[PDB]
Structures are given as structure tokens and as C-alpha cells.
Ligand SMILES: CCCCCCCCO[C@@H]1O[C@H](CO)[C@@H](O)[C@H](O)[C@H]1O
């Protein structure tokens with residue numbers, strides 16, 4: 001009966017709220033330099049579905065992570081094309097909001113093509129839009145609009161997420177949908193971005 | 207800018223300098239003389255010789271003042287500025303030449319479908335002014351745009367004669383023809399219709 | 415005075431109604447909700463977009479923090495977007511959540527707000 | 534480093550607008566970029582500005598003329614936003630659009646050459 005999934009919740013309280021609105025919630029555990037095996041281990045126990053979130057990692061950390069942690073969903077968020085491309089080539093499960101901190105979508109037709117080939121999804125996050133000024137919001141939306149176009153054209157896996165860092169960042173599924181609509185998606189497409197597609201991405205962890 | 211393209215007319219300029227500027231961008235300019243007590247037959251007659259095409263502008267007039275003007279000055283264009291439906295109604299019935307932005311200082315388009323047909327029956331036109339929009343704060347501008355959008359729908363449906371104008375009261379209020387046209391587009395007009403509101407329709411109004 | 419007359423069933427504005435709930439620690443008054451909705455619309459949709467979407471608060475119940483906001487029939491997702499981007503008002507953090515949408519106020523109440531004691 | 538120009542079918546479809554600023558005061562390129570973004574944001578909102586994609590290509594303080602890009606389908610909305618500007622940094626001004634073209638080259642040749650452009 002239509003299951004909705006939040007692919008990127010990064011906070012305890014947020015998780016509690018998300019679980020009340022989404023059938024499934026993936027908790028992303030952020031890491032900068034090293035992947036705390038202990039922390040990550042305890043995370044899976046408390047939540048169940050956990051993703052390793054590499055925040056602007058260096059290629060080595062990416063290769064190393066996908067090398068001995070493939071069993072865990074792997075997310076990469078960075079504003080560096082080099083890392084973005086490499087992360088996609090390495091086969092991470094998703095690239096999250098590459099446009100953040102860039103003056104472009106952080107993706108083109110070449111990278112989009114590479115993502116569909118390497119089974120890598122693009123994550124459209126709401127959070128950057130919540131606390132940014134008017135100028136920033138306008139640009140973020142412009143880039144997200146272009147990213148959507150590329151994703152649609154090349155059939156790249158995609159999902160809408162709050163990428164919540166606090167309970168206050170979380171939004172109801174049908175509201176998250178409106179974000180998709182505003183950036184160019186049809187209602188059916190936005191719905192799939194928080195149900196059908198999340199399902200496909202999580203498939204691998206079978 | 208004065209012959210090659212379409213003849214553009216500014217039906218509502220209310221300032222000397224505005225006029226001078228408008229005369230550089232519009233082929234023809236109509237200067238409105240504002241009267242809110244009596245129609246100074248003097249300044250009105252002299253102003254008509256300094257600008258050429260002139261019109262009497264009555265702001266928040268008394269039904270009585272309107273009746274007197276529509277008669278004594280059947281040779282002048284009479285414009286009415288009121289946020290009073292009663293005064294707006296009467297002005298339409300008396301055959302005045304146009305009602306200017308009835309939505310100003312109101313909480314509705316200042317015109318419904320019945321007045322829209324009454325205007326068409328009395329040949330009264332509807333003027334859409336840019337000025338109120340210029341000086342309004344965000345909240346005010348949003349409301350004005352909503353009212354104007356509705357006004358346009360009524361006018362387009364019932365084929366009421368209409369025109370866009372700067373209703374300039376100062377040099378700085380005037381806008382180039384093609385730019386003024388965007389106001390019409392934004393409120394609902396197709397480019398071809400917006401252009402018509404500052405050329406074809408003004409003609410008809412001046413036809414008399 | 416003599417207010418204008420309704421308007422033909424083809425020119426009349428077409429509307430949809432949104433039922434919403436405000437999640438927060440602090441309370442809000444009907445006026446604050448009217449103000450925060452206008453504020454977000456003006457920022458997110460601009461003066462022009464606000465004139466197109468025509469956001470209009472029908473009613474807000476301070477007790478349950480639920481309410482009804484109207485929008486042009488064809489731009490409901492844009493109003494839902496403006497509401498979603500709200501994070502705080504008058505120093506109070508909040509989350510606006512849309513409960514449902516309907517063509518009429520009566521239907522909206524029946525399926526989404528009766529539960530909150532609207533009736 | 535550097536994304537690749539998207540295929541003609543996916544690339545943005547733009548229109549370039551030549552304009553002139555009428556005023557007693559002077560304006561720098563920075564002031565013009567700011568007033569355009571300020572007006573777009575106020576008039577069109579964050580969402581509308583994202584759709585219109587206004588972008589100052591170049592401004593010439595000497596002749597007070599410049600080029601501003603816009604999404605092809607929404608030129609009239611930027612034109613409107615520009616028209617609602619009346620004062621910036623304490624200086625009254627009127628923006629006048631001179632013309633439009635699908636390319637910068639053609640825009641200049643047609644409306645800015647007379648101002649000494651290129
Ligand atoms: C700033 C963002 C602007 C987005 C453009 C929205 C256009 C939808 O708006 C509609 O456009 C129609 C024209 O086809 C007009 O006739 C309608 O009156 C108008 O409401």
C-alpha cells in the first residue's frame with residue numbers, strides 16, 4: 001500500500017519524527033576523515049537502516065569506504081567535480097545535492113550518463129533551501145531544476161529528502177512532493193522519488 | 207520611435223516634464239488635468255493649447271460635479287478616478303470617456319461583470335495605471351496585481367475598451383512603450399493585446 | 415455599500431482548499447498565521463506569484479493549531495511549497511504540514527478536520 | 534573540473550535584452566547587477582527568479598547601457614521586474630529595454646553598436 005521512504009535523516013529526534021510520517025527511514029551517519037567502525041556499528045543496531053555519509057571526502061576515503069563497507073549504503077556529498085566523478089565511478093549509492101556551494105548543478109549530461117551506468121542515484125535535498133537567503137534559494141532552485149531535467153532525460157535514479165539535521169527540518173511526504181513539483185517533476189514522478197526509487201536503491205542491500 | 211512602427215499613445219500623463227519625456231517615446235500624448243472641486247474652464251482651456259490633446263480628470267468627484275462636466279465640456283475627454291462604486295456607477299451611466307484604475311484604494315477590482323457590460327453599453331473605457339504599482343510596498347503590489355488581473359479578465363471577455371498608461375505625475379513615472387506593454391502581459395494580456403491597449407484602443411477613445 | 419456581484423461560473427476564481435497543521439512548541443494566533451503565510455508567499459512566490467496563487471487564510475484554530483488556507487485551483491503545489499519553506503515566526507520554530515486538499519471547504523472539513531473537532 | 538556544455542536539447546534557451554538606464558546619477562556594474570537581482574527577487578520571488586534566470590552579462594557605466602539575459606519564455610516577466618525599479622542607492626532611474634535577441638553578437642550589432650559596443 002504505497003510505502004514512503006526518507007533516504008536521508010541525520011538526527012535522532014529527526015528520525016523519531018520521520019518514522020511517524022515515512023514507512024522507512026534511512027539514517028545517514030556523517031564522516032569527514034575516517035569511518036568510525038564502532039559508531040557505525042552501533043548505529044545499525046539502534047536504527048536498522050543506516051547509510052555512511054562521506055562529507056567532502058578525499059578520493060582515498062571514498063575508495064577505502066566502498067572497498068570494506070559495500071555492505072552499507074554509501075552517500076557522498078561534496079562540491080568538488082573530481083570527487084563527484086570519482087565517487088560515481090567507485091559506485092557509491094548516491095550523490096547528494098552536488099549543487100550546494102557550487103555555481104552550477106554539479107552535474108551534466110556526461111556525469112548523468114555515468115550515474116545511470118554505475119547505478120548511482122542523485123539526491124535532491126530540501127534543507128539547503130530552508131535556511132538560505134533569497135539569492136541563495138533562487139540559485140539553489142535553478143540548479144535543482146536543471147539537475148532534474150538531466151535526471152529525467154537519462155533516467156538516473158533520484159529521490160527527494162529533507163536531509164534533516166533536526167526534527168524541525170523534517171517534512172511530511174506529500175509536502176516533500178511539492179518540492180519535486182516546483183523543480184519540474186509531475187506529481188507521479190515526485191511520488192516515485194520517495195517510494196519506487198528509494199526501493200530500487202535499497203534493493204542492492206538485499 | 208515616431209512613424210516606422212505602430213502609433214503608440216499615452217492616454218494619461220499628468221505632469222509637464224512627464225509629457226516632455228512621454229512625447230519622446232509615444233507618438234501621441236494625452237495630458238490629464240485633475241479637478242476635484244470645479245472644472246476651471248480657464249487652465250483647462252489654456253492647458254489644451256500648451257499640450258494639444260488634453261482631458262479632464264475628476265478624482266473622487268461628486269455625482270453632481272460629473273453631470274455638470276459631461277455636458278458643459280462635451281468636446282473634452284472626461285476621466286474619472288474613484289474608489290466609490292456609487293460614483294463609479296454614475297460616471298459610467300453619464301457616458302464619461304474612461305474610469306481610471308477603480309481598484310486603487312479598494313479591496314476588489316472596483317468592477318464586476320455588470321459594470322463591465324454597462325461600460326460597454328455607455329462606451330466607457332477602463333484605464334490600467336502603472337503608477338499605483340510603482341510606489342506600493344510588496345503586500346500592496348500583490349493585491350493590486352490580483353485586482354488588475356481580474357479586471358483584465360472582465361474587460362477581455364465583455365470586450366470593454368481598455369488601455370495601459372503610466373498615469374505619470376512626474377518624469378520618473380514614465381515608461382517606454384514596449385516596457386509598459388509587459389504590465390499588460392503580466393496581468394494576462396497576450397503581447398498583441400497589450401500593444402493594442404496603447405495604440406488601437408486609445409484611437410477609438412479619441413475617435414470622438 | 416453596494417458590493418460588486420459574484421461573477422459568471424467561467425470568470426469566477428477557481429479555488430482549492432488546503433487543510434494544514436502547525437507543529438510547534440509555541441502557540442500562534444490567527445493573525446500570526448495570516449501574517450506568516452503572506453510573508454512566505456511574498457518571499458517564495460514574489461509579488462507576481464502571490465497575485466497568481468492568491469493565498470488566503472480561511473480559518474485557523476489556535477487550540478489544535480489546524481487551519482484552512484485557500485489558493486488558486488491550479489497552483490496548490492506552489493502554495494504547499496511556500497508553506498513548507500517556513501521554519502519560524504516571531505521567534506517560534508515550526509513545521510507546517512499539509513493534511514489534505516479539496517475543491518470545497520465542506521468536503522475538506524469532513525475528511526481532514528472533523529478529526530480535529532472542526533465540524 | 535568544469536562541466537560540459539549540455540546538448541542543445543537540454544541547454545537553457547535564452548534571450549538577451551539590451552537596456553539603457555535613464556537617470557541623473559551614475560551606476561557601477563555592481564550596482565546594476567544588484568538592483569536587477571533585488572527587483573527580480575521582490576517581483577518574481579525566489580521561485581520566479583529561478584525560472585526566469587536573470588543574469589547581467591555586461592553594463593557600460595559610460596553610456597549607461599548593458600545586456601541582461603533571461604529564459605527565452607519569460608522575457609516579459611523580467612521586463613516587468615525591470616520596469617518596477619524607480620530608485621537605487623538614492624538615485625532615481627528609469628530602465629528602458631532597447632531590444633531583444635537570441636544572441637549577444639546579434640543584440641549588440643542591432644541595438645548597442647550605436648553606443649560604441651564592440
Ligand atoms: C515569475 C514567474 C512567472 C511564471 C509565469 C506564470 C504564468 C501563469 O499565469 C497566467 O498566465 C496566463 C497567460 O498564458 C494569463 O492569461 C493568466 O492571467 C496568468 O495568471
Ligand SMILES: CCCCCCCCO[C@@H]1O[C@H](CO)[C@@H](O)[C@H](O)[C@H]1O
Nearest residue numbers: 184458459460463492577578580581
Ligand atoms: C513563483 C511563481 C510561480 C508561477 C507558476 C509557474 C508555473 C510554470 O512552471 C513551469 O510549468 C510547466 C508545466 O506546463 C513545467 O513543465 C515546467 O517545468 C515549470 O517550470
